[PDB]
């Protein structure tokens, strides 16, 4: 035969496709879990990047093989669907191929394996949805306080766990707003975590409102105001210019003087229109003139200068005000009355050590707050801010999706017993397809036990010993919803520990891994050109 390449068919292309796919699983085997190990990503230039996140591992992993190129696209179907889950699809689907490769040597055609996998996947969603938990127990009943306390144990904040877990539980429930037909989700923006030196870490206070890290300057102006109008503006009340790169020409020396007198006179006209609206809360990015601050201490307007731009975007979103970029309305100068102003209740200049902050209370629609992490030095405050941010996203991603499931090895250990008893109920050349589907789901506690420095033959088997008793008899002495605590090396209940996972990350993982294992198993011939 004279063709334009090399041809190879048979079972030898089946064994070569599963050995190339399971080798990619070994790249993401040790990096699974919160205790996952780092791996070096050698570039073609010569530099190396140390990443342990499995989503960034498969993005930079370049294997020029079509069996490994199939597993590259499921990372793009995972983040666009839910956003998490990625490498748990890879270890499941590669162990699905390795168990199915043993079936090819045992005189089973893969057509019974493909049709058996789709019925094993649909029955896996049925057993999961019959054992779910509705998104509730937000107040009064803990699986939360204890849920965020496990994430906080790795840092120095974990000495007083009950003191700091209450600051993140009430902050998560404060940022809840439906806003579409009764959705309620949680926004990507969260509470602003500031820091100060309050002589110990025990002086943190849960402030129910946003706190600005700015100082008002003068003292003769009163710090306690009662009016509700809040003004936000981006144009500078200082001496203005045309452009940083384009300038106006000044030829005569006396012509230079009269534009300076006009700058002192046009500042008197702009302050007449701002204070006519009644707005006392004045926040200016570009700064406030020195003679303009003289008019604010007699009128009683709480003027704050040199405010950050990203802080003002959360302030204008709080009171529902509009950010004004330029004060000139394309032919003259106006203040845009009753448009850029919001409503509030009380703004107090609270005495906080080394940074006197500005707190706002009862705005229009903010739902945000602030946590003042008072401490001793910059070492303990910077590590506690990232601990609050890591504990915020744990409680956030759970209480969004409308129902959750106790995860961390509790899902796959319960599915290994039900799908085996379901496999003995069908027959018809698909019993071995579902029985090997149950053993292929056991690699999720198997890789978690070897990463927790425990005996993998004991820790996985302790999960299945408790999940089998839930199916034998419905008595309450059977332990139900048993998770995997990788820290102590002992299985515990996920309802008491608060370890929860969304359902859409668990359903779409079993859906995508079986469809990826179907496509590689359908390859029986190789053609190259």
């Amino acid at each position: 035969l004279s063709v334009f390449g090399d041809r190879s068919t048979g079972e030898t292309i089946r064994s070569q496709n599963v050995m190339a796919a399971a080798s990619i699983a070994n790249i993401v085997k040790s990096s699974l879990g919160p205790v996952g190990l780092d791996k070096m990503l050698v570039d073609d230039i010569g530099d190396v990047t140390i990443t342990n996140d499995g989503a960034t591992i498969l993005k930079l992993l370049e294997v020029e093989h079509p069996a490994a190129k199939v597993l590259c696209e499921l990372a793009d179907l995972q983040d666009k669907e839910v956003g998490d889950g990625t490498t748990s699809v890879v270890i499941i689907a590669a162990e699905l191929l390795k168990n199915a490769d043993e079936l090819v040597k045992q005189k089973i055609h893969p057509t019974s394996v493909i049709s058996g996998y789709r019925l094993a996947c649909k029955e896996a969603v049925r057993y999961i949805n019959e054992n779910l938990i509705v998104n509730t127990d937000e107040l009064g009943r803990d699986c939360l306080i204890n849920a965020a306390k496990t994430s906080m144990s790795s840092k120095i904040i974990g000495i007083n766990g009950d003191f700091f877990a209450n600051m993140v539980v009430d902050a998560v429930l404060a940022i809840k707003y439906t806003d579409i037909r009764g959705q309620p989700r949680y926004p990507v923006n969260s509470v602003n975590i500031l820091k100060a030196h309050g002589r110990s870490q025990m002086e943190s206070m849960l402030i129910s409102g946003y706190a600005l890290n700015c100082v008002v300057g003068s003292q003769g102006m009163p710090k306690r105001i009662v009016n509700a109008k809040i003004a936000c503006l981006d144009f500078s009340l200082q001496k203005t210019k045309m452009k940083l790169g384009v300038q106006v020409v000044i030829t005569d020396p006396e012509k230079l003087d009269q534009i300076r007198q006009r700058e002192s006179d046009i500042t008197k006209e702009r302050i007449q229109k701002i204070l006519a609206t009644g707005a006392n809360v004045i926040l200016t990015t570009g700064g406030i003139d020195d003679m303009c601050l003289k008019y604010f201490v007699e009128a009683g307007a709480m003027a704050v200068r040199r405010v950050l731009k990203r802080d003002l975007k959360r302030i204008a979103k709080a009171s529902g005000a509009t950010i004004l970029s330029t004060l000139a309305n394309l032919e003259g100068e106006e203040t845009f009355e009753a448009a850029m102003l919001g409503q509030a209740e009380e703004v107090v200049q609270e005495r906080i050590c080394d940074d006197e902050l500005i707190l706002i209370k009862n705005t229009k629609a903010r739902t945000s707050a602030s946590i003042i992490l008072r401490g001793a030095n910059d070492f303990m405050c910077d590590e506690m801010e990232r601990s609050l941010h890591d504990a915020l996203c744990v409680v956030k991603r759970v209480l969004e999706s409308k129902s959750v499931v106790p995860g961390g090895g509790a899902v796959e250990a319960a599915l290994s017993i039900y799908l085996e008893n379901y496999a003995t109920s069908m027959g018809s050349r698909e019993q071995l397809a579902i029985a090997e589907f149950a053993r292929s789901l056991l690699v999720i506690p198997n890789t978690l036990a070897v990463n927790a420095a425990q005996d993998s033959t004991d820790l996985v088997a302790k999960l299945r010993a408790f999940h089998n008793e839930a199916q034998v008899n419905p008595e309450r002495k059977n332990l139900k919803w048993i998770g995997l605590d990788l820290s102590n090396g002992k299985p515990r209940d996920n309802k008491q520990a608060g370890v929860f996972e969304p359902t859409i990350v668990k359903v779409k993982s079993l859906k995508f891994a079986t469809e990826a294992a179907i496509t590689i198993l359908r390859i029986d011939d190789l053609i190259k050109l």
Binding site: S23, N26, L37, D38, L61, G245, A453
Partner: protein, 512 residues
Amino acid sequence: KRESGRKVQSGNINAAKTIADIIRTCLGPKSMMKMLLDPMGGIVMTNDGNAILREIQVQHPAAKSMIEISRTQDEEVGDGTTSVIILAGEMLSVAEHFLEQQMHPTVVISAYRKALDDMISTLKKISIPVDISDSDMMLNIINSSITTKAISRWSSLACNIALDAVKMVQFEENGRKEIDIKKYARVEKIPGGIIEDSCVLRGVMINKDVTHPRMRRYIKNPRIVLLDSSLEYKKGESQTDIEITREEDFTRILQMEEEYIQQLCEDIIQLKPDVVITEKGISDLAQHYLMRANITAIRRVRKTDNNRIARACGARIVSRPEELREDDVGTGAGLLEIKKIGDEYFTFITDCKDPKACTILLRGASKEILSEVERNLQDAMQVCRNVLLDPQLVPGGGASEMAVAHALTEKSKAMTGVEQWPYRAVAQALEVIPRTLIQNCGASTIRLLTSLRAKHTQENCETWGVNGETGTLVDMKELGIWEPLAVKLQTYKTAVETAVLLLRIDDIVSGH
């Protein structure tokens, strides 16, 4: 191709042990020299550990990570880079607990990070406060680096250069006491003169020469002006080029070039200045209208050097040359001077105060002597920076290593669990710093190190160190071998941060 499993856990160990075995004998005042062979036959006999690994190419990804973590550590502090790579290679060298015991690295990292908290707690117990107000105590700290140098003839004057430079940059009002030598203490070299001529002035010096005598020579009230825009032909928003090849194009371009520059130069001379400073370049025709007003032309200055000029006099940074005003004045400056120093012209905007900036002026008989002082003073400035950052010293010369390793042995008797076995290995890995000091001296290492541990057990742990000159054990309270605390704090921190990075790597894969 690819490699995973336990082979990369042993492969990264031998990659870091090979780098540590090269510069192991280059520790102390008796540091052995190393000979580098070039492809062109050149040979450099430098014993500096930063100079050896820079001129040696590596191919291992773990060995490449070993050099860059000490190179960044050299930019932070100017001392202690050799002790980092030695300690990072000794902590990974006991592979009996890594491979033979079949232990996961997570047990080792939980034992290594728990031993990191005992590094900071032990060094604060053997510390000693420093009377930084006395200049005699500051001379006994910087003298460890001035020995065996050409600057050692003028140690009484070279110590006044580095001490006055760090105190002006350090701001006590901010609380955190920041010192940055690269920006606020920019060192410049001037040929000519002697070593005694080198002094410290309170200002910023401009190395631009004087090309015309129609300039300001001595001005008591300098009127300074800062500008960001360029002084050249007007370019458009497109990317067109300027090419003058025809006589008709030569007249039309130069008439537009003269009319725009004279319109720009009329706005700066209406305020009657003394020196002009532009961010971009100044053309030749722009100096023709500038020399009629007798203004010193200073061009080609960076944006980072521009704010040091604005904080020296108090001027305003103006973006465009048409938008000058009367507030752009330099009232309060000391004197403007364009006086030549060794047939090189330098502009002086110095003052009689501390305007949050300074410079170092070096002089010498030849240009090789100029390069000798600037590499000794910059090494001396970072050591004296760590003393003023925190006035605390530690007993150096291996005394702090045996004091730390003694505290880990008594702590390991109360540390139960599986992690107590790699916890005791860090105590024996920290003994490699007094181990190589005796081996470089030439005495019996194990005969002296065993009596060194017996002195650290019964007697006080703050004394009985090693002297790297005679080869015996002396008391550290008698000799000035005291090390700064912030150097030894970041040394054990980086050696743990290197060992937490190389032991956590479990796979090496390729891909662009």
